[PDB]
Amino acid sequence: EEERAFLVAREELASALRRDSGQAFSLEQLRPLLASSLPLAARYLQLDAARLVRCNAHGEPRNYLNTLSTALNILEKYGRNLLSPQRPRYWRGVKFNNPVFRSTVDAVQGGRDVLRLYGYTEELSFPEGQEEPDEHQVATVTLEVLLLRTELSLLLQNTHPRQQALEQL
Amino acid sequence: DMYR
Prior knowledge:
CATH class of chain A: Mainly Alpha
Structural class of chain A: mainly alpha
Distance between the termini of chain B: 6 Å
Distance between the termini of chain A: 27 Å
Largest sheet of chain B: none
Number of strands of chain B: 0
Oligomer: heterodimer
Radius of gyration of chain B: 3 Å
Helix content of chain A: 40-55%
Strand content of chain A: under 5%
CATH architecture of chain A: Up-down Bundle
CATH topology of chain A: Methane Monooxygenase Hydroxylase, Chain G, domain 1
Number of helices of chain A: 8
Largest interface: A-B, 15 and 4 residues
Number of domains of chain A: 1
Helix content of chain B: under 10%
Shape of chain B: flat
Radius of gyration of chain A: 16 Å
Structural class of chain B: little secondary structure
């Protein structure tokens, strides 16, 4: 009933990302995804947002939410790359020893599992059978990653429309 | 950068 209204908007913005990879989203456009009474598992279907937040929630929120948002900012770019009309050269390969990754994403519990959602299944890299990334899935994960980074930033600045429910994590 |  009301979960459908969320999914429609969720899909409509996912489609937007597939058309334009560098498409930017305001808080005005993200509104129906932010002000929905749904729980976390019903709003993040691919991303395990609950585990990403609570398993890195040690210390001060002003510090772990920024470490978390920093990782989500890179993960979103990992997605936008696969969606670009021309994809980067070494797109199918992600090395742990890589500077940007280990310094950012691999500093967060569950950062790797997000890449597996993108398509990097064989252990990270794409399987040989996969010659090109799934345009629908990536855009969906990228949207959820972007959505989570957005929610955390509204948490850090105490403006989230459901701030008095998310702080239970 | 992000792949190396």
